[PDB]
Amino acid sequence: EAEAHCQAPDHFLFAKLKTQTTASDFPIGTSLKYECRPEYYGRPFSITCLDNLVWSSPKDVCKRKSCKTPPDPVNGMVHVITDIQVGSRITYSCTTGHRLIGHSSAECILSGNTAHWSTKPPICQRIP
Numbered sequence: 001e002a003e004a005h006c007q008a009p010d011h012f013l014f015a016k017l018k019t020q021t022t023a024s025d026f027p028i029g030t031s032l033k034y035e036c037r038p039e040y041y042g043r044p045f046s047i048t049c050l051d052n053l054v055w056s057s058p059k060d061v062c063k064r065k066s067c068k069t070p071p072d073p074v075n076g077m078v079h080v081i082t083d084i085q086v087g088s089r090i091t092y093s094c095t096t097g098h099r100l101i102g103h104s105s106a107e108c109i110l111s112g113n114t115a116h117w118s119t120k121p122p123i124c125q126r127i128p
Contacts, residue, residue: 002027006049014040014062036062039086039110065115067108075124076100086110094124101125
């Protein structure tokens with residue numbers, strides 16, 4: 001006996017399947033393992049086939065990697081345009097009077113194991 005089956009799990013994209021599988025229709029009562037992508041963090045979760053031919057509703061389990069906010073530079077401050085994930089770039093701007101020394105806008109990225117800004121935070125110094 002095994003009436004009803006949970007249809008093929010929807011594509012997460014940010015998670016690659018990680019469990020023995022050789023069929024389209026999955027049997028209810030079975031968690032499928034999925035590991036997020038490098039640019040993501042939240043350990044390997046799993047969607048449980050409940051009964052209504054549906055997979056357990058996953059909350060905020062998977063989340064794109066994010067770099068730690070850079071310390072505000074002396075006589076200045078960085079403004080995030082949206083956020084600080086491995087894709088969003090933060091703009092640096094010193095308070096009126098002193099010009100920034102170093103770069104202009106560092107983009108948050110990822111090497112593979114750990115996320116880090118493409119360029120270290122500049123500085124600020126009175127303009128000659």
